[PDB]
Structure formats: structure tokens, C-alpha cells
């Protein structure tokens, strides 16, 4: 029986857009943490809202009365910021969050050699708040891996965070895990690093795909979105970016990030409304739209005016875009969440039945089936021909 275990108004500091908000709240007996426009049961929360092991700490800047959940999601630090006016309800909001959490955990557990000597340190691939991500070498095999390393100190304040390496995702188009360990202090998971090139490369050079490479690509962007909304994990993070083709062509979507890219924002998550699955297909509405156009739906200079197109501006296209093209990405890019291509029920269901899939085969796609029409000039996965 989920219950509410705590309401009320709080003021939230934008993911993005760093501005308070006054925010409704309710904290929940499964452990989802979610605000509101106004005081609004329900179905599946997703995780990326949950207070499940997360650390909470006491602030005071920019303002008094400040506190912090921050939280390891897969290998991920995830901070939110939240303000109250007086120090009790910091407190009283502080205690409530720790009780779910630790109720979460007790209910979890009722319920159910590699060092860092170990591998030859070669580029530094990103930095955050948090942590860093590195290309490394495993020496004893000369195989290529990126490191996400991060201070224990940030979410440990610990063998336990090692049990990733079993919640590990198997799916053919996303990053797994290879190791995770830690030192003294801190937490190492190296997980693969595919040779294929960045997408944004690819892209770059030839201008524009085709139709038929950008339907390979989204079919098995899709792929990995439906595995990841089915466990209840919304990705929040498609752009170009964050695609790179493995050897053999077939996409790699990277698991990279360190606490962003206006230009992809939904419109919902720049009005810090309460988002869902929906963002996700907004966002390969807008890679889709790059692969197929060359360029950008919404770009502007000026980040008053972009977020004006994102939320106001009706999305163009080129007319040589077949009409079953022009239709999917009109769907994708629905402002309204609701209205959106995906956004309904079925989630996923209903991308992958629009008419411009119908040439693919759902199961060809996920078992690795479909000829990747693109092949990267690398002829193994040690070839580090587009490592620089
Ligand atoms: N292994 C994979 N390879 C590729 C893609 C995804 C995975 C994957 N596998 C996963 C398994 C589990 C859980 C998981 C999720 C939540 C709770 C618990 C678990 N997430 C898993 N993701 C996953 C989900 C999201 C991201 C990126 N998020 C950025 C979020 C953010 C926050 C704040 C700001 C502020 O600005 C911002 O910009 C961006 C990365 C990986």
C-alpha cells in the first residue's frame, strides 16, 4: 500500500536552468520523491526520482535552509537542491527523506583482484563535479576501457556499491560494466568504450544521412530505451554526444556523465514541470532530426530566444524528407508530453509501430540482426584508429 509520507511546498532549484521554484512535493513509501505545479494512486514512479541510498546534507548557500539529496544512480552522481524557510523544516523534510530511505533498504534486503595498477591511464574523456572518466588500457590484456573514477567521499560519506557488476544491463546498445572496485579512496567502474568513432564525428563528415542510417540508428536507439523505461529508468541524456558506433557499426549509447546542452531541453523539463518516459523520445526526436537534416530544430545564440522555440516555435523541415519521416519526428517533437509519439501508455509500443519503422523487425533489432549500413574502418576492438 503506497502512501504519502510527506507533502508540501519546497522550493527546487532547476536541473538546468539554475532558478527556484516553488514545487508541490510528495514523498511516498516507495521511495519516489516528485514535485508538482500544484497539490494534484498513480503508476510505476521512475527511479531517477527515488531517495533510495541517496546521502542528504544541510547547506547554507546561496541561502540559509538548503539541503541536498544526492544519489549514485547506476554509476551516476545525481544531485537536487531544495530550499525551506525555516531550519525545523529543514529537519522535519530531512528526517521524513532518511526514514524512506532507510525503510527502502531494509525492504531490499528482506526481499533478496583488479586494482588501479592495473591499467595504463591514456586520455582524460570528461570531468565533473563528482568525478572524471578516463580511457584506460587493461595491461594484462590490451583491451580498452573508460573509467568512471569517483571520490567515495561524494555518496559513501562500501564493498556493497560493487554489487553493480550484477544489476549490470545486458543490453547489445548501451554500456556495460566490465569492473567495478574500489580504493581507499575512491570508486573505480570501468565499463566498455566502443572504437567504432563518435556519431557527432560520423555526422560531422558526411552532412547528412540518409533516411534509411538514420532508421538504423533510431531502431536501435529505441531498443535501448524500451529496456531502459521498462526497468523504470528514463535516460534524460540523448544527443549526439552521447552515440558512438562500435566496431562493427551498431550504435553505443555512453554512459559518461558527470554533474548540460540546451539545444536538446524538452519543453517540459525547461519549465521544471514533471517529466517522464516522454523526454526521452523528445529526445531522439531532435537526434533524429540532426541525422536527417544536418542540423538543429531549435538553435539560437541566445538561450532566451532557443527556449522560446523549444517551447513556442513550430518545427520546420526540409521537403525532400519523405512524409513518413516528416510525421515521426512531428510526433517526437509534440510539446505537449502527452500528445507526444511515445509518451502514452504503450511507451515505446507506439514508436516502434509509426510507418516509418515499418521496414524493421523489433526482435532483428535487439538480437544484433540488422546489417549495420555503416562499417567504421577498424578491423578489431583494439584498433585505435578513431581514438584521435
Ligand atoms: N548502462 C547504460 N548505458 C547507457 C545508457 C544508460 C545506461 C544505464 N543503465 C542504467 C541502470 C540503472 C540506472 C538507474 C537510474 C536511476 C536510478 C537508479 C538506476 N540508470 C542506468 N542508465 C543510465 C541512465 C541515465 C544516464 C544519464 N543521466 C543523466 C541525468 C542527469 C541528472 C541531472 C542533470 C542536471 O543538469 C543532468 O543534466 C542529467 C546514464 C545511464
Same mark, same amino acid.
Given at each position: 500500500?503506497?502512501?504519502?509520507?510527506?507533502?508540501?511546498?519546497?522550493?527546487?532549484?532547476?536541473?538546468?536552468?539554475?532558478?527556484?521554484?516553488?514545487?508541490?512535493?510528495?514523498?511516498?513509501?516507495?521511495?519516489?520523491?516528485?514535485?508538482?505545479?500544484?497539490?494534484?494512486?498513480?503508476?510505476?514512479?521512475?527511479?531517477?526520482?527515488?531517495?533510495?541510498?541517496?546521502?542528504?546534507?544541510?547547506?547554507?548557500?546561496?541561502?540559509?535552509?538548503?539541503?541536498?539529496?544526492?544519489?549514485?544512480?547506476?554509476?551516476?552522481?545525481?544531485?537536487?537542491?531544495?530550499?525551506?524557510?525555516?531550519?525545523?523544516?529543514?529537519?522535519?523534510?530531512?528526517?521524513?527523506?532518511?526514514?524512506?530511505?532507510?525503510?527502502?533498504?531494509?525492504?531490499?534486503?528482506?526481499?533478496?583482484?583488479?586494482?588501479?595498477?592495473?591499467?595504463?591511464?591514456?586520455?582524460?574523456?570528461?570531468?565533473?563535479?563528482?568525478?572524471?572518466?578516463?580511457?584506460?588500457?587493461?595491461?594484462?590484456?590490451?583491451?580498452?576501457?573508460?573509467?568512471?573514477?569517483?571520490?567515495?567521499?561524494?555518496?559513501?560519506?562500501?564493498?556493497?556499491?560493487?554489487?553493480?557488476?550484477?544489476?549490470?544491463?545486458?543490453?547489445?546498445?548501451?554500456?556495460?560494466?566490465?569492473?567495478?572496485?574500489?580504493?581507499?579512496?575512491?570508486?573505480?567502474?570501468?565499463?566498455?568504450?566502443?572504437?567504432?568513432?563518435?556519431?557527432?564525428?560520423?555526422?560531422?563528415?558526411?552532412?547528412?544521412?540518409?533516411?534509411?542510417?538514420? #532508421?538504423?540508428?533510431?531502431? $536501435?536507439?529505441? +531498443?535501448? !530505451?524500451?529496456? %531502459?523505461?521498462?526497468? =523504470?529508468?528514463?535516460? &534524460?541524456?540523448?544527443?549526439?554526444?552521447?552515440?558512438?558506433?562500435?566496431?562493427?557499426?551498431?550504435?553505443?549509447?555512453?554512459?559518461?556523465?558527470?554533474?548540460?546542452?540546451?539545444?536538446?531541453?524538452?519543453?517540459?523539463?525547461?519549465?521544471?514541470?514533471?517529466?517522464?518516459?516522454?523526454?526521452?523520445?523528445?529526445?531522439?526526436?531532435?537526434?533524429?532530426?540532426?541525422?536527417?537534416?544536418?542540423?538543429?530544430?531549435?538553435?539560437?545564440?541566445?538561450?532566451?530566444?532557443?527556449?522560446?522555440?523549444?517551447?513556442?516555435?513550430?518545427?520546420?523541415?526540409? #521537403?525532400?524528407?519523405?512524409? $513518413?519521416?516528416? +510525421?515521426? !519526428?512531428?510526433? %517526437?517533437?509534440?510539446? =505537449?508530453?502527452?500528445? &507526444?509519439?511515445?509518451?502514452?501508455?504503450?511507451?515505446?509500443?507506439?514508436?516502434?509501430?509509426?510507418?516509418?519503422?515499418?521496414?524493421?523487425?523489433?526482435?532483428?533489432?535487439?538480437?544484433?540482426?540488422?546489417?549495420?549500413?555503416?562499417?567504421?574502418?577498424?578491423?578489431?576492438?583494439?584498433?585505435?584508429?578513431?581514438?584521435?
Amino acid at each position: 500500500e503506497v502512501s504519502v509520507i510527506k507533502e508540501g511546498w519546497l522550493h527546487k532549484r532547476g536541473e538546468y536552468i539554475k532558478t527556484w521554484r516553488p514545487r508541490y512535493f510528495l514523498l511516498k513509501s516507495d521511495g519516489s520523491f516528485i514535485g508538482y505545479k500544484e497539490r494534484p494512486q498513480t503508476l510505476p514512479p521512475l527511479n531517477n526520482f527515488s531517495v533510495a541510498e541517496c546521502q542528504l546534507m544541510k547547506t547554507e548557500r546561496p541561502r540559509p535552509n538548503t539541503f541536498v539529496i544526492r544519489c549514485l544512480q547506476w554509476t551516476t552522481v545525481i544531485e537536487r537542491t531544495f530550499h525551506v524557510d525555516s531550519p525545523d523544516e529543514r529537519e522535519e523534510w530531512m528526517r521524513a527523506i532518511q526514514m524512506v530511505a532507510n525503510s527502502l533498504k531494509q525492504r531490499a534486503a528482506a526481499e533478496d583482484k583488479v586494482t588501479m595498477n592495473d591499467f595504463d591511464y591514456l586520455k582524460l574523456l570528461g570531468k565533473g563535479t563528482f568525478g572524471k572518466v578516463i580511457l584506460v588500457r587493461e595491461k594484462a590484456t590490451g583491451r580498452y576501457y573508460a573509467m568512471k573514477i569517483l571520490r567515495k567521499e561524494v555518496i559513501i560519506a562500501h564493498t556493497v556499491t560493487e554489487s553493480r557488476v550484477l544489476q549490470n544491463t545486458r543490453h547489445p546498445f548501451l554500456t556495460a560494466l566490465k569492473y567495478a572496485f574500489q580504493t581507499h579512496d575512491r570508486l573505480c567502474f570501468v565499463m566498455e568504450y566502443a572504437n567504432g568513432g563518435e556519431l557527432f564525428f560520423h555526422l560531422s563528415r558526411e552532412r547528412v544521412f540518409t533516411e534509411e542510417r538514420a #532508421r538504423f540508428y533510431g531502431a $536501435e536507439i529505441v +531498443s535501448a !530505451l524500451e529496456y %531502459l523505461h521498462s526497468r =523504470d529508468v528514463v535516460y &534524460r541524456d540523448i544527443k549526439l554526444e552521447n552515440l558512438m558506433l562500435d566496431k562493427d557499426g551498431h550504435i553505443k549509447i555512453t554512459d559518461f556523465g558527470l554533474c548540460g546542452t540546451p539545444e536538446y531541453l524538452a519543453p517540459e523539463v525547461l519549465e521544471d514541470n514533471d517529466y517522464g518516459r516522454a523526454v526521452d523520445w523528445w529526445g531522439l526526436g531532435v537526434v533524429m532530426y540532426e541525422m536527417m537534416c544536418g542540423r538543429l530544430p531549435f538553435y539560437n545564440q541566445d538561450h532566451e530566444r532557443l527556449f522560446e522555440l523549444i517551447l513556442m516555435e513550430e518545427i520546420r523541415f526540409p #521537403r525532400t524528407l519523405s512524409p $513518413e519521416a516528416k +510525421s515521426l !519526428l512531428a510526433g %517526437l517533437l509534440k510539446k =505537449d508530453p502527452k500528445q &507526444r509519439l511515445g509518451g502514452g501508455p504503450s511507451d515505446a509500443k507506439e514508436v516502434m509501430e509509426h510507418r516509418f519503422f515499418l521496414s524493421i523487425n523489433w526482435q532483428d533489432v535487439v538480437q544484433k540482426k540488422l546489417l549495420p549500413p555503416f562499417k567504421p574502418q577498424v578491423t578489431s576492438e583494439v584498433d585505435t584508429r578513431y581514438f584521435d
